[model samples]
Target: GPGSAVAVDPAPVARALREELARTLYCEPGDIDDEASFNTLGLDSILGVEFVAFVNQTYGLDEKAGILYDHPSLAALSRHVAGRAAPV
Candidate 1:
């Protein structure tokens, strides 16, 4: 199965993740503001872990936490993923 592959457009997935995270966490996904926070978004460390798992599952990313560390903002995260997201 070495030839098997999975590839998706990263920007779109990043955008979708941001939207869903905003909706599920009660943040502003569509607004110009990108001050995403655990407290303001009603998320905790537990939720962060679960959300990261969801992203990895949904987007097929292995190092999803790197995204959070590098790009904490929705826009920045999306851009970063779009730029460097893995293709497999």
Candidate 2:
């Protein structure tokens, strides 16, 4: 499974996202700009879908196939994910 989100811990999800995206994009995690759009990072629609799949696995969320469009950047998605947390 991909790194799931809302792992009953938002912070770890965020960190895992950074790490996963960094590795996927072949860059240092710290070098990834949270504010950068996935498009700006050269991510195509296929990759976008893949990202959504990763989200589904990581967050235990289903059919999140189009959620990435609403949260196009790491920062936006991170905020949305953290907001979805229900506390430990």
Candidate 3:
């Protein structure tokens, strides 16, 4: 059987980001601020690098992507990727 690609799911992805961020920082998902600096979440350089790598790997983003900057927050990142998907 052949496999197909699915469009980017922004809302869920946003939730996932908060989940992962919470998991990584040992906080509750509800604690994340959409426009607040990720640093407020207690992330350091090592985790920042890890965050970027993880998102890229999971989302199939380009190797050049630095998720930390482009998608600074759950909401910001979600908007950047919304509706920019190919048909599956």
Candidate 4:
């Protein structure tokens, strides 16, 4: 298990979203705009699915893989996930 790595605590939602988006976009977390389009950030269909998968794992959500297009922006996606995570 030479490839094993250190584990870290889960970050709070907003910060995690920003940090994840930044890593996905290959930029600094501070550069991400909550209202900006993932399309504009070079998120093609494949990357979009990867993004959804990332969120699903990180947030323990069961979102459909193709759902990213319906939201299409950081703020919208975050809201959607938050809605799901909200207590029913």
Report the number of clashing residue pairs per model.
Answer: 1, 3, 0, 0
Question: Per-residue lDDT of 1-88 in model 4, one digit per residue for the tens?
Answer: 4787843322245677777778777988767777887778767777667777888876678777567788887767776777676343
In model 2, pairs of residues that clash are 4-58, 5-58, 5-59
Q: Each candidate: what lDDT?
A: 0.61, 0.69, 0.68, 0.71
Clashing pairs in 1: 6-88
**Candidate 4 lDDT (Cα, 0 to 1):** 0.71
RMSD for each of the candidates: 8.2, 8.0, 7.2, 10.5
| Backbone clash total, candidate 1 | 1
Query: Model 2 shows how many backbone clashes?
Result: 3
TM-score of 1: 0.55
Best-to-worst lDDT order: 4, 2, 3, 1
| 1-88 per-residue lDDT for model 1 (tens digits) | 4786855555576667667677667657764244554345565556666677877676566654545656666656665556655666
Question: lDDT winner among the candidates?
Answer: 4
Best TM-score among the predictions, by candidate number = 4
lDDT of 2 by residue, 12-75 (tens): 6677778767766667877767777766666666666776677767666564546667887887
Per-residue lDDT of 25 in model 2: 68
Model 4 weakest 10-residue run by lDDT: 6-15
Better-scoring candidate (TM-score), 1 or 4: 4
